[PDB]
Amino acid sequence: RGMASTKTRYEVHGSHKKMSPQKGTGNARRGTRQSPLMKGGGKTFGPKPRDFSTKLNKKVYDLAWRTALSYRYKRGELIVTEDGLDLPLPNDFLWLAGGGKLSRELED
Amino acid sequence: GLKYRKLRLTTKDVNKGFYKGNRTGSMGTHTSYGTYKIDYTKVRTYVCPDLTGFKLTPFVSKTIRPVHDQFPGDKLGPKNPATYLARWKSENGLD
């Protein structure tokens, strides 16, 4: 999906006023409250919504498709059947389910 | 100048012309002398009837279970003007 999002110091709420005077306080100088060093500051290199998709040549993707079929074929894990592939459920149950005699609980 | 100043000003907090009534209603007019003349056309009276011999009370015995009215096939059952008129002709036609 690639939709994660975090706020930087340029998107965190609040005013961009200078917190403390540049000097005279004896404490470490500070700028805005939205700095990453501050409690509720913004994550500098945080996640942003972007596209995580990559490219793959149509010919390489087609070779990987037949390579997966060949892996199953050479191992006996590829079973090809005739068209009309469906589970042969009993005709009695199929007749009840359509009729509505069977409840959802029993039908499932 | 602190928290109390931020509360809404009331007549019990200040003087010097701060008048604020309580929505009692104008019962007259002011004069130029600083007095008040009451206008009895604005004064209100309470019409309470005679309750002697009145058998109804604000309660009904719980032996009579609550029941709502039924108006089958009538969307505006109790608000039907036709039912009010039809019920008027039969009961009271004079007035």
Binding site: - | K3, K6, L7, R8, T10, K12, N22
Partner: protein, 76 residues
């Protein structure tokens, strides 16, 4: 008119507001009227004054204990 104390909407939380004021009126009657005297604590049993007095005492102790704590103190 009797004013009501300014309070917070939720007691200890919320904005500060003030409930509506109370108005009392004293009428000068043409015929006197005298109120009965309140029943004695021994005759208030029709109101379950015994159970009500026990609950009241417990509530008074609870508010007194909170007041001691509000002073930053504890009962030794």
């Amino acid at each position: 008119v009797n004013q009501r104390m300014h309070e917070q909407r939720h007691g200890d939380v919320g904005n500060w507001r003030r409930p509506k004021s109370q108005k009392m009126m004293i009428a000068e009657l043409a015929k006197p009227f005298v109120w009965p005297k309140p029943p004695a604590e021994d005759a208030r049993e029709a109101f379950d004054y015994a159970m009500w007095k026990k609950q009241k005492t417990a509530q008074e102790q609870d508010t007194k204990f909170q007041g001691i704590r509000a002073q930053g103190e504890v009962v030794p």
